[PDB]
């Protein structure tokens, strides 16, 4: 339960498979809903139970309410801490683009990674998690762009 | 049945590779949590 970034694994398919990634902060595990569909999670001998989730935001927290409340400043470069399946964690610096929506503007990062990278954290220069990677769209040219998906800290 | 495995600290890396562009895109979010291009 140490703070940090975690792979989300399952052994239901052939071998061991990385279905996503998440953030442990303040005793709570944060990932995207489509990684776990809200299932409970094993952490060693222990169990993590879902606490909050929302399919439309595509987010879920375990053991407690969503804790991550940093936001992109709209100006500065950020870093995807990508945790790809079978590969070491690596930081990728980028200047976010913008998802313009009817409900306001969302930061977005134009970085393409395997599906099981879903949930990897996006960081500001202070190392704070400004959102999670992996809910996005494919652009008119076939490239992938992810929202910077951030929850609300109750 | 799913399990988690620690993979690192959450830290900014001074020497990080820089890449990707900064597209400005009109999108819609539907009730299923899917983004779409307008």
């Amino acid at each position: 339960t140490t703070d940090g970034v975690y792979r989300v694994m399952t052994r239901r398919l052939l071998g061991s498979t990385q279905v996503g990634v998440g953030v442990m902060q303040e005793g709570v595990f944060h990932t995207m809903w489509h990684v776990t569909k809200g299932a409970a999670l094993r952490s060693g001998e222990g169990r993590l139970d879902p606490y909050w989730g929302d399919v439309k935001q595509d987010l879920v927290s375990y053991c407690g309410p969503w804790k991550l409340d940093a936001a992109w400043d709209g100006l500065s470069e950020v870093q995807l801490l990508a945790v790809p399946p079978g590969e070491r964690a690596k930081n990728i610096q980028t200047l976010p683009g913008i998802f313009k929506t009817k409900d306001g503007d969302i930061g977005a990062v134009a970085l393409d990674y395997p599906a099981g990278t879903s949930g990897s954290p996006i960081l500001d220069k202070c190392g704070r998690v400004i959102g999670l990677y992996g809910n996005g769209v494919v652009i008119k040219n076939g490239s992938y762009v992810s929202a910077i998906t951030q929850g609300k800290r109750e | 049945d799913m399990y988690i495995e620690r993979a690192g600290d959450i830290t900014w890396e001074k020497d990080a590779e820089v890449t990707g562009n900064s597209p400005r895109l009109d999108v819609a979010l539907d009730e299923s949590g899917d983004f779409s291009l307008v």
């Binding site: 995207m32 489509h34 990674y113 599906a115 099981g116 996005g136 992938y144 992810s146 | 899917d34």
Partner: peptide, 6 residues
Amino acid sequence: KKKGXX
């Protein structure tokens, strides 16, 4: 969309 095939 979630980009791996989507």
